[PDB]
Design a protein around this nucleic acid. Structure first.
Ligand code: TRP
Ligand code: MG
Ligand code: MG
Ligand code: MG
Ligand code: MG
Ligand code: MG
Ligand code: MG
Ligand code: MG
Ligand code: MG
Ligand code: MG
Ligand code: MG
Ligand code: MG
Ligand code: MG
Ligand code: MG
Ligand code: MG
Ligand code: MG
Ligand code: MG
Ligand code: MG
Ligand code: MG
Ligand code: MG
Ligand code: MG
Lengths: 117, 201, 144, 64, 17
RNA sequence: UAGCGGCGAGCGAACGGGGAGCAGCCCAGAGCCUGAAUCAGUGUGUGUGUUAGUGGAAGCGUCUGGAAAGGCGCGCGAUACAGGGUGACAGCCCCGUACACAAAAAUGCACAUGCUGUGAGCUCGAUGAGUAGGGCGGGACACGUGGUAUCCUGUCUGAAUAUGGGGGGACCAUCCUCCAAGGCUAAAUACUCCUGACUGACCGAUAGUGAACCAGUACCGUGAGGGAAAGGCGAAAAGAACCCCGGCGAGGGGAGUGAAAAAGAACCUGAAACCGUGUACGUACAAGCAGUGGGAGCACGCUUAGGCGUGUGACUGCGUACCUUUUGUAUAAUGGGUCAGCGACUUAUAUUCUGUAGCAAGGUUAACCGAAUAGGGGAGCCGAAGGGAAACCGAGUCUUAA
């Protein structure tokens, strides 16, 4: 019972080379090179799913820090005053009100100042 | 129990051990698989690196040519070289214990009764070796795919069934596990129902 | 039941190991042989009883005894075998005809193993003390 | 084909009732004068093969 | 064919004995 | 297994049992009586096989289609539904098949018969000498010189003749068994250059023979010798009349054939590497395993009272390939130019453990026989009892005087 590998091998190779669309040079044409590229693309995508959470929070902190100092208080004192006032809005939403509703954000700074003072 | 007949609406008395025991699926599987392994002929072979035609000359010198090491053109890595683990002719037959073979027949036989795929008569023959006679007889009984087991095989019935591919006719000594499971119905003459039970002890 | 409705008993058909067929299989790239060495080579491995060059066990220890040619032509008979002869008389010839001892046996002994519930006549055999009491308890007799 | 017994092992081990092997003790062939009688007296009876050595013996004597 | 002439020459090959 | 063995690696019987097949004779010599068995050769007859052959059943309507053997409807043959072909898949179109027949001539068997050579039976007698054995050296016996029986002989010797000789594993005695030194003999057994039929959980063009093809060829070597690559138009050549550009070219464009010509002979299908043409986006102030997470703009589609899909990706955070070998590799250690195809834990037979099925103090047969995966065959093997070096003893036994 001789088995020929032609039809199965071609389909396994075609699966990898479809994931390599858009890569430069041999990385989208040549299996030995496209295989290593699709593996490293999955290594990066796993690693960068953790980092997407770190990079967005770091961005929200910078936009809260900027809008708070426009109201006369720093970030580290603004967040502390929200804890003493028992306000529990996360930084994702605070960075959203800072940009889109600056009159609500002022009301948050006054509440933080009243509790901190 | 007693199998009801179809010639006289009489009954035939049969052993409970032979026609009434439970179905032992794991034992009958080992017996129909062993049957099929014994029908294999197993004739094939390939050539190792020893038997491929060629010379024993080393293709190029061991060192200095810049090519991978080679020692033979018959190497199984090379095109047109030997097969690594080439086949030989082999015997694929297995052993069945006598008691496991007889036990599977009783499990098979009692399942046919339980699924009313077994039909008992004492009258089954034809007057001339004509295929159209047997085919008309089977039409009356509402049988199309059927195994007919007879006490002693008649020449008229053997010759009348050769050209019908859905019909096989056998003597009581020539039943086998695989044929009882293959055909849709089994017809036994009440003298074959006799002889099978002494054979099955 | 049809030819495509029969299945084997669960746990009867373990699949065999297939070495060198990938990472995911657990036996790839080396086939469970570990890294280099004599034992990892094709056809490698040391012979039976090799200990590294240290004088092996079956050459460290002395030989003892001899083999007796008389022991091969001697048999034991159990008490449960006495009911299996024909005619109620037990001798060498009747034990060979019952397929109890081999055709080349010349001496036999009846030992206390099993039990006897019928009167037999043991003839020409050696009988242990325990079996002599057991044969006579059932109504038999022993001669020589 | 049939496995072949290591014929020099069969001259040195005998199998016992529960599957162990018995053997003769070493050190009782010569310079015996200088040995103590207490030492020699304990080397006379046959011994049993230890647990670390059973694997080697069983492979050598497949028909024992 | 044979080896390159500089790969056979002792002077070129044997520079670090 | 018993044994042999630097008692190592290893080598490895016989006796006895079950089967297949079965067959016994002649010379070393005279007489009586003859040709009486048997075999060999030839001739003829009879039967039978081989080498060419003969006959061999039974289907049309309609739908799709280039074409019907296919779908659907209604029939018939079958001792024939093995197989192959036919414009797609045919029991009934063809060749066949089951079955039934056939030989002027040559030949293989088996008988019978004729002739030729052969001599059958009885009585009495004889009973294989440089031989058996020995010394020395080697070889074969499972047996390596060992305590080594038996066989063979290069060399030197050397008997007794049924009132006698050989063997029975050193050797001797008793007993048992058989007659060397002359010869012939069927079957069961081994094999396949070659012929025929059939079969395959064998291959299907880098496989299977080295060779599906004008292959042991081309080609290579002084020579012995080594040794390739290369299959497929179509159902049918209907293999492209004629016209046009061109060199009275190559090549192409039409026309025509065809179901199809992007089936056009470099011809079924026609993948990937590799090379191009067209369109959308990006790209000429910008530094690195070339991705990944975020992300504007643009282009094309969608669908609505919107932002979704596809392509591209300015800018930006993080980010030094893979295999191998190593304490440890981005390593400036190994390996790989890339693609497509092939390429490495198998097979047989012993043995132990695990799972599972059967039967269970029992389980199971091997060769072989068999109208043959059935049934028979229990020869054997393993288990139910051990201890001892062994005789021996035995639910005990060895140790020891205990
Ligand atoms: N260098 C010279 C001579 C030469 C021939 N073969 C050689 C081999 C090794 C050294 C030198 C040579 C050449 O190439 O013609
Ligand atoms: Mg090949
Ligand atoms: Mg059988
Ligand atoms: Mg692992
Ligand atoms: Mg390695
Ligand atoms: Mg190492
Ligand atoms: Mg190792
Ligand atoms: Mg004809
Ligand atoms: Mg002698
Ligand atoms: Mg003797
Ligand atoms: Mg092809
Ligand atoms: Mg080929
Ligand atoms: Mg083509
Ligand atoms: Mg720019
Ligand atoms: Mg390591
Ligand atoms: Mg190092
Ligand atoms: Mg590093
Ligand atoms: Mg490198
Ligand atoms: Mg570099
Ligand atoms: Mg390299
Ligand atoms: Mg590849």
């Amino acid at each position: 019972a001789r088995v020929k590998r032609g039809v199965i091998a071609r389909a396994r190779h075609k699966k990898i080379l479809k994931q390599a669309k858009g890569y430069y040079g041999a990385r989208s044409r040549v299996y030995r090179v496209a295989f290593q590229a699709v593996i490293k693309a999955g290594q990066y995508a796993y690693r960068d799913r953790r980092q997407r959470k770190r990079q967005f929070r770091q961005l929200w902190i910078a936009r809260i820090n900027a809008a708070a100092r426009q109201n006369g208080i720093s970030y580290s004192k603004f967040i502390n005053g929200l804890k003493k006032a028992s306000v529990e809005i996360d930084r994702k939403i605070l960075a959203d009100i800072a940009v889109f509703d600056k009159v609500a954000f002022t009301a948050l700074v006054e509440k933080a100042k009243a509790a901190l003072a | 129990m007693e199998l009801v007949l179809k010639d006289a609406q009489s009954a035939l008395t049969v052993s409970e051990t032979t026609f009434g025991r439970d179905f032992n699926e794991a034992l009958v599987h080992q017996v129909v698989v062993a049957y099929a392994a014994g029908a294999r002929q197993g004739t094939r072979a390939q050539k190792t690196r020893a038997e491929v035609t060629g010379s024993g000359k080393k293709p190029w010198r061991q060192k200095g040519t810049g090519r991978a090491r080679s020692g033979s053109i018959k190497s199984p890595i090379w095109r047109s070289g030997g097969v690594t683990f080439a086949a030989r002719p082999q015997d694929h037959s297995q052993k069945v214990n006598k008691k496991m073979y007889r036990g599977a027949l009783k499990s098979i036989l009692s399942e046919l009764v339980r699924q009313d795929r077994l039909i008992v008569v004492e009258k089954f023959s034809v007057e001339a070796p004509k295929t159209k006679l047997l085919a008309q007889k089977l039409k009356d009984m509402a049988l199309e795919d059927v195994l007919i087991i007879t006490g002693e095989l008649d020449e008229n019935l053997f010759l009348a069934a050769r050209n019908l591919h859905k019909v096989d006719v056998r003597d009581a000594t020539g039943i086998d596990p695989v044929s009882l499971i293959a055909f849709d119905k089994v017809v036994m003459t009440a003298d074959a129902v006799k002889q099978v039970e002494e054979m099955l002890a | 039941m049809r030819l495509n409705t029969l299945s084997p008993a669960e746990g009867s058909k373990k699949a065999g190991k297939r070495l060198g067929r990938g990472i995911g299989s657990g036996l790839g790239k080396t086939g469970g042989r570990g890294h280099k060495g004599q034992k990892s080579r094709s056809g490698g491995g040391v012979r039976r009883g090799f200990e590294g060059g240290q004088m092996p066990l079956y050459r460290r220890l002395p030989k003892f005894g001899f083999t007796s040619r008389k022991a091969a032509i001697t048999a034991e008979i159990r008490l449960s075998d006495l009911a299996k002869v024909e005619g109620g008389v037990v001798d060498l010839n009747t034990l060979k005809a019952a397929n109890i001892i081999g055709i080349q046996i010349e001496f036999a002994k009846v030992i206390l193993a099993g039990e006897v519930t019928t009167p037999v006549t043991v003839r020409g055999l050696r009988v242990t003390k325990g079996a002599r009491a057991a044969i006579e308890a059932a109504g038999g007799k022993i001669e020589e | 084909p049939k496995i072949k017994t290591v014929r020099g092992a069969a001259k040195r081990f005998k199998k016992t009732g529960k599957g162990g092997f018995k053997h003769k003790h070493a050190n009782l062939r010569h310079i015996l004068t200088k040995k103590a009688t207490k030492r020699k007296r304990h080397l006379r009876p046959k011994a049993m093969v230890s647990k670390g050595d059973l694997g080697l013996v069983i492979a050598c004597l497949p028909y024992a | 064919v044979t080896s390159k002439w500089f790969n056979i020459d002792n002077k070129i090959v044997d520079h670090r004995p």
